[model samples]
Target: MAITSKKIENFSDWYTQVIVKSELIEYYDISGCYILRPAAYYIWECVQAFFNKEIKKLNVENSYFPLFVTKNKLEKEKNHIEGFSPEVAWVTKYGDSNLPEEIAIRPTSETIMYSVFPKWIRSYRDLPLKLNQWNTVVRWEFKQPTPFIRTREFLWQEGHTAHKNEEEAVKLVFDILDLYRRWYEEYLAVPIIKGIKSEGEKFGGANFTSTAEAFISENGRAIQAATSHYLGTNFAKMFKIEFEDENEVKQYVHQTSWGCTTRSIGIMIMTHGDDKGLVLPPNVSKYKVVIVPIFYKTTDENAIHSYCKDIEKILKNAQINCVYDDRASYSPGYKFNHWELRGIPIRIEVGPKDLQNNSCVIVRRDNNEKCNVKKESVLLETQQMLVDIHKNLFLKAKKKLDDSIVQVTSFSEVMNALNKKKMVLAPWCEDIATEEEIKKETQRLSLLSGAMKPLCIPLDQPPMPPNMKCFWSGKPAKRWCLFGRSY
Candidate 1:
């Protein structure tokens, strides 16, 4: 079946159908788990290849650990235990007999991995133990799951690093976050904001957490695309990862961990895709270019097919991913719809008329822009179109983000902003009590994330509005923060 609708017509339905019809993934009998298909898994492979090199450049070593941690070990850190306890999945029984100690199916891995940090580090020379792992993680989710965005069992990469001092550990967290931002923006062409998550939204046991978020869909809500956390010495202290310095003094290792999941593929879909289909970034695009040969009642099918095969050879020699769509059963219109539905970034259309002219038409998926390229310059012309498609998509998303933001003066205004489905930038008292009040008064609307770097005032630019105060309470404002209704 052909997908005739566009995103503006039905945002939710368009997104849902495009994912399935494009063969990215499939739903399963398991409540929140979905089967990952080849098309979608290939996206992960592209991301992994890019991210692995970044980790290696940062000197982080890759390793594997057990999937389950014993109850006693999981409870070593009070805050960690309290935070994850409710969501932890347990294995209390073995195959035939009951096990003595309950084991938690690793929700986050801090407890299991840190337990070994102590034995691994003996001196300052062994202080910074940077390890990373790529694997599937299990977490029990109570919400109705979306196929790619939210699920119980998901694939992700986690990086854990330990240093001798707080300065070094904190620096690493932000550095990794920066890398995440660059990868998303430059490679995926999805612009995002780097910010600090509030106490209410911070990771369970970490001293603090940082995140990169964006609003790609028509809805103004921002999604937490990735996260980096600074664990301080809490986990190291709990595990006794004390290392001897050159001066013979002992100190606990400071720690940091960061991660991203397949949810990124979901974000790419939402950010660049429209009603026509999924628009892909050139770097990770499965097929960068697709060639479609056109024919008619008076056309020479054999000659056109031979010409397309030769062009395919040139593209293959250039090491470019390309596909020649020459199915005789389907008409040119059918082939065009098929490629567009799959979101091929660029389409090459050649007909007998074009052959006479020594040129063919290339259509871009991002904006439906079309161009003519000489048969001899086919590869060069296609490459330029791919570059423009990525830039155009990014700019469009950035504009939406800019226009969807709102600034308010009072609690009533806060409700108005959220009800209108806009993200609000307002003065906030950076404390737990006031944040909770804002959360409650606003009727559970989202407080996306706090900015470490204040980029703008409520009205976009500012002399710091004198009449404006914290929306939750009349306390003096600390800095501006973004709030919105979210998923």
Candidate 2:
């Protein structure tokens, strides 16, 4: 079935329709879990390849950890586990037998990994231990579940590193943040804002948290793309995860833990997908191009099929992932819609006329721009078009993001812009209590429906006048916080 909902009219329904009709995901019996079909898994694999290669260069070796943690081990760190306490899914029984000690399916690996970290590092030699895990985590919370964005179980890469000094650990936090920014922009073709979370919005035990924020054009809502945190010896101190320093003094390792998840796929789909279906960037599409042969009753079917096959061969030789759609069951028109719904970046049509001219017609999925390419230029033209489509998608989405930011200096300005679905860039005191009051006031006053919070303090902050004060608390403004309703 085709997607029938209008994206601009109802984004929530449109998102559900496009993802299902395009065959990226399928609903399961569980409340918040969805099956990642081949199309979705393919994109996730591409994400893994790009991320794995980057982390590999940093020598962060991948390893597996236990999926379940004991109650005592998980609760060892009070501050660390406090935030996840409500969401942690525990196993109290197996089959018909009750276990004496409850086992928790990890909401995260900080507690699980650090429990064993002490045993592995006894000296300064093992002080800087950088390890990563490609895994799934279960957090049994979310009242109204969306597939990848807010699910009970999902896939992600968690990187946990220990450093001998604070500088080394802190650097890796931003290093991972930059790496994820590349993954979102370069691989997924989605633009993002690099920023840090407010103290009230930060990870429970982290000294500070860094994040990548992405905007949804239809609703002017932002999504936290990924998070990297600077733990600053918090977890290490709780778990007694210490190593002998160069001077023979035992010191706690300054640590960082970061994660990027399948939620990114959701963000990309919402940002670029159309009313018809998914619109993919070549970098992550399962197949960048699809070759379809067009024929009539009197046309030479063999000639057209051969032409399509030849184009496929050319694409293969150029290291392009492509498919030749020569199925006897479907008409050429049907095949065109099929590939379009699947979001192939380019579609090459070889009909009698084009075959006779020694050329083929190339159609872009992003904008539906059609151009005929001669046989000799097929490789070069297709490669260039793919690059162009990627660039176009990024810049267009970037424009939408830029246009949504409205600078507001007072409560009325904040409420007025928010009611119009704009992200408010306002000054704040960066305190927990005031941030809480701001959220409550925004929720109570604005005509908007969801909870509004300070999304982040943009890494790029604009200069403020010396007399500038907070819009709500009226305290001396410390930073210009990007406030918005987020996913």
Candidate 3:
């Protein structure tokens, strides 16, 4: 089916249309959940494969933990427990019988995993224990759910690590955050701002949180792509994850937790997708090239098919992911539109004329540019085109991020920036109360119901002015912080 909604005019409807039309996901019978079709699952698999390999290189081992958390264990860490209390899904009955105590579905594995850490680790030799789990998390969210963005249930990778010292723990936090940033910028062709989160915005009990922030082009709002948190000894103390150092002194292990969910896919869709449909980056596309054979007469059919098959063979030999659309039931135009809707990066059209001339017409999905390529150079040129496509997508997205940000010195300027669908970078003190007041002011100042708040204190933030005041509190500026509406 064709995308009937205009992406620029109706973003929500357009997004739904693209995902549905492109066969990425379908709304399930249950509310707040979606069924991932092959088109989407393959992309997720790509993410899992790349991240799994990278983390493995850092000596992180994969493990599975139980899905259910006991009520007592779930509430072990006060701050972490309190933050997730409202969203926790519970099971009070089993097999039509009432259970004595309620069991909570894991909203996160922190409580469940850490409760057993003390059992597995003992001394400094067991220090810097690193483990990651590929799993699904549930939150009984009451807000209206959007497919990949705000689904009540989603797939993600949560990595938990323990270190002998804060130095190693903090290094691990940024290292994973950098991996997340590279995944977005390199593989997904989406630009990101790597940064530290404010106390109010950090993980509930985390000492601090670092993040990779992305922007949605349609609404000019920020989306947190992923996060790495320095959890410190919050859970360690509660769970008694203690280890004796080389000095024979008992101490709590420094801890960290980091995760990135399918929400990254949503960001990719929003950032790179166009009016046509999904515009996947080459690295994530299941089919990097889709070859459509064009034939106007039955007499030329066999020849067109032969040439297309040959092209596929060459591409396969080059270690390229490609497919030949040889289905006779569909017209060439229909096939082209179908693949375009599915966001195939390159489309090669081989017809009777092309066969006689020993050339084919190649079109890029990103810019819809058409060019003729000699058959001999198709493999090399197509490979280069994929590289170029990714570069262009990243550059285009980076420009949008760069253009949408306006540096402001006052609250009025922040409001003006939001009014124009732009985000603001302004001086701010790292005061939780002041941040809360600023958030309230954002809502109060706007005629719109939901206003804006701080996105992050970007890692590559601008240098602070020597004697400038906070935009909201009039306190001395501590750092440049990003302020915007977010998903």
**Residue pairs with clashing backbones, model 2:** none
lDDT of 1: 0.79
After superposition, candidate 2 runs with Cα above 4 Å error: 446-449
TM-score of each: 0.93, 0.98, 0.97
What digit string (tens of lDDT, one per residue) describes model 3 on residues 29-145? Answer: 999999999988888999899999999988999999999999888878779876899899999999999979889999999999999999888999997899999999998888888
What value does the lDDT take at residue 334 in candidate 1? 85
Residue 420, model 3: Cα distance from true site in angstroms: 1.7
By TM-score, highest first, what's the ranking?
2, 3, 1
C-alpha lDDT score of every prediction, in listed order: 0.79, 0.90, 0.90
After superposing candidate 3, which stretches have Cα over 4 Å from the reference?
Answer: 297-299, 447-449
Give a tens-digit lDDT track for model 1, residues 387-458: 888888788878887777777656667666665657777777767766556556565444432221222222
Pairs that collide in candidate 3 are none
- The residue-level lDDT of candidate 2 at 379 comes to 93
Q: List the residue pairs that clash in candidate 1.
A: 6-275, 7-275
Name the lDDT of candidate 2. 0.90
Clashes of each: 2, 0, 0
Cα error of candidate 2 at position 20, Å? 0.2
